[PDB]
RNA sequence: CAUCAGACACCACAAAAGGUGUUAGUUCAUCUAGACAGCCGGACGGUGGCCAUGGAAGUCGGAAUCCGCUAAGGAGUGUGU
């Protein structure tokens, strides 16, 4: 009999969490966050995948749950 | 041989002692004519410390610094008719409250003749203590005599 | 007038620190201006009590590693309802006077420092 | 401003342990169980260890953030009731009426029965809820002890106590007499 | 006869109140504004008035 | 967040005055030189100061509005007599 608080177990913004960019002229690459600004935008980097070095909204992109 | 303790007080010659002391085994018409050989100079307000052993009245007399200021004032009023204040200025005193201030016991935590002497002498709102100036404004102009009470 | 009573404050520890070298760090809580009136008229001979905030003892003892460092071992013996004592009697009298007299029915030692060490006493 | 995260420390003591499910909170220990619904506040439970559980907010407002402080409030609440219990004593107030309180069972609701109110007829009967014991005190006179696990069971039977004897039509300030809320204590004699 | 100790929490909860100029709601003794919505949440407060 | 929501010119209305309801901002002071709030203690001595003396010691009432120890404590913020 223990402390059995289950998981409510998220995935985490960070540096180096790697995205799926669904919207846009990228519209389904991989990313990585560089740098978070706010609540709200982060920027991003793809670069062996393609898209170059901006700063975008969390609208417009997925959290995958792989990190590095 | 007990201990009784009781603190008597202001009073012109012979001036309510039957309700503090009955318990100390002394009396109470006699206690009053007691305290007449002490504050009898002294005809002015101050305390007595009274210390009765259960079979006798025996009175001492407490060292008031106030009162002592009041020692080197004017004494004049005889009872009850002065008609505003009874309150009287008088001499200054520069040197005699300086010695007799810091010879009431050293009261207030005095670590000098000047402190002792700007205490009970800068506490005058009775007397003027100058021939040409006022009190409670020469506690950082009284520098003189603090090595030899000390 | 803040500003020159904390600098006056610092002026006056950087004093009595660099003029005595025996340190009584007392454990003193809850007590009265009846005690406390007659340390002050018993300790004119010897000893400076010095109480006060001593969680600006803290800023001052960050702000004073230039001169003497071995007064760095202090800041964890600064917590607790403590004060000082500034004198040049290194053991004996001024502990016996601080904890035997004036008891009655909280006037401890709880730290001893004489020129960089700590000594039980 | 929108805090991006906030965050409170729950000390869970040795002879209790908690359980939540998804806000449904538990905590069974050395007098009982206690269960609470919270989920009409959305808060987020981390434990970190055995004794420790981390409460934490995100990105929320300001009634937000004070909502995550209440419910810190409400589980240490839970976890002092069923370590040590709540007791409140309540003393009456009275000038020349005595009020007679007993504890009668009306088919086994329980009521707590107050009788000659200033002089009234009426007999003003409240509901004892779940849970708490009520007791009257040893030589103490015109005491009445509510004791139990839930603070909100035993303050607010204290309360609906409180409120059967107002006075209705009077001085409130003058005509005193009523019964009322003394002492706010632990079950456990030590604390 | 109320035997002071007892009067004294009485007057914690019937005459240590606070009471609102707008709309004299019994307000807790050291409150700074009304609670109530009708009056505006009004800072315009006095204390109780006690007997005599 | 509205137990009177608001919603697009003319056009079919609302004001002065308030809110520790919430969001920003200006200025000053404390400010990180451990503040503020809370809890635990002090909250002195001259001094029942001078007094009107049944009695007034901070406290029916009047004017002076002081000094020493201070880390700090007022010729006192009311209650009590």
Redesign the interface.
């Known amino acids: 009999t223990d402390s059995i608080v289950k998981a409510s177990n998220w995935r985490l913004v960070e540096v180096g969490r790697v995205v799926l960019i669904k919207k846009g002229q990228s519209a389904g690459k991989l990313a990585a966050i560089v740098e978070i600004i706010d609540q709200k935008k982060v920027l991003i980097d793809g670069p062996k995948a393609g898209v170059p070095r901006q700063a975008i909204n969390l609208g417009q992109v997925v959290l995958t749950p792989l990190t590095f | 041989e007990v201990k009784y303790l009781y603190l008597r007080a202001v009073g012109g010659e012979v001036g309510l002692a039957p309700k503090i002391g009955p318990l100390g085994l002394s009396p109470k018409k006699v206690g009053e004519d007691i305290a007449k050989a002490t504050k009898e100079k002294g005809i002015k307000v101050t305390v007595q410390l009274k210390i009765q052993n259960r079979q006798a009245a025996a009175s001492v007399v407490p060292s008031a610094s106030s009162l002592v200021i009041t020692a080197l004032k004017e004494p004049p009023r005889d009872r009850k008719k002065d008609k505003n204040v009874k309150h009287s200025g008088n001499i200054q005193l520069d040197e005699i409250i300086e010695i007799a201030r810091q010879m009431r016991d050293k009261s207030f935590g005095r670590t000098l003749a000047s402190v002792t002497k700007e205490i009970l002498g800068t506490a005058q709102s009775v007397g003027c203590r100058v021939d040409f100036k006022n009190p409670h404004d020469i506690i950082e102009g009284i520098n003189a005599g603090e090595i030899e009470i000390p | 007038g803040i500003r020159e009573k904390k600098a006056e404050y610092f002026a006056k520890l950087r004093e009595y620190l660099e003029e005595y070298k025996s340190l009584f760090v007392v454990g003193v809580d809850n007590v009265s201006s009846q005690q406390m009136h007659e340390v002050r008229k018993e300790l004119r001979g010897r000893a400076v009590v010095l109480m006060g905030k001593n969680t600006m003892v803290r800023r001052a003892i960050r702000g004073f590693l230039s001169d003497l460092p071995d007064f760095e071992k202090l800041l964890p013996f600064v917590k607790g309802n403590v004060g000082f004592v500034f004198t040049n009697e290194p053991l004996t009298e001024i502990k016996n006077v601080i904890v035997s007299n004036r008891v009655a029915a909280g006037l401890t030692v709880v730290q001893v420092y004489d020129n960089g060490q700590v000594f039980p006493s | 401003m929108?805090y991006?995260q906030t965050e409170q420390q729950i000390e869970?003591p040795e002879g209790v342990?908690?359980?939540?499910?998804?806000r449904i909170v538990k905590v069974?220990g050395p007098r009982g169980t206690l269960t609470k619904n919270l989920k009409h506040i959305d808060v987020?439970?981390?434990?970190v260890?055995?004794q420790l559980?981390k409460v934490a907010v995100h990105?929320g407002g300001r009634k937000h953030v004070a909502a995550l402080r209440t419910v810190k409030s409400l589980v240490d609440n839970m976890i002092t009731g069923v370590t040590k219990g709540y007791k409140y004593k309540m003393?009456y107030?009275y000038?020349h009426f005595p009020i007679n309180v007993n504890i009668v069972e009306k088919d086994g609701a329980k009521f707590i029965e107050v009788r000659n109110f200033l002089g009234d007829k009426k007999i003003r009967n409240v509901p004892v809820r779940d849970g708490v014991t009520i007791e009257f005190s040893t030589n103490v006179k015109d005491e009445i002890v509510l004791s139990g696990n839930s603070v909100e069971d035993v303050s607010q039977n204290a309360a609906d106590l409180q409120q059967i004897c107002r006075v209705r039509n009077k001085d409130?300030?003058?005509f005193?007499d009523?019964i009322?809320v003394?002492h706010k204590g632990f079950i456990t004699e030590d604390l | 006869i109320i035997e002071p100790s007892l009067k004294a929490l009485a007057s914690k909860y019937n005459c240590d109140k606070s009471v609102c100029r707008k709309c004299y709601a019994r307000l807790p003794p050291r409150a700074t504004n009304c609670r109530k919505r009708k009056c505006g949440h009004t800072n315009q407060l006095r204390p109780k008035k006690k007997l005599k």
Do not use: C, D, E, Q
């Open positions: 929108k991006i869970v342990t908690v359980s939540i499910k998804s069974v987020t439970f981390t434990k260890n055995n559980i990105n003393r107030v000038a409130i300030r003058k005193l009523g009322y003394s």
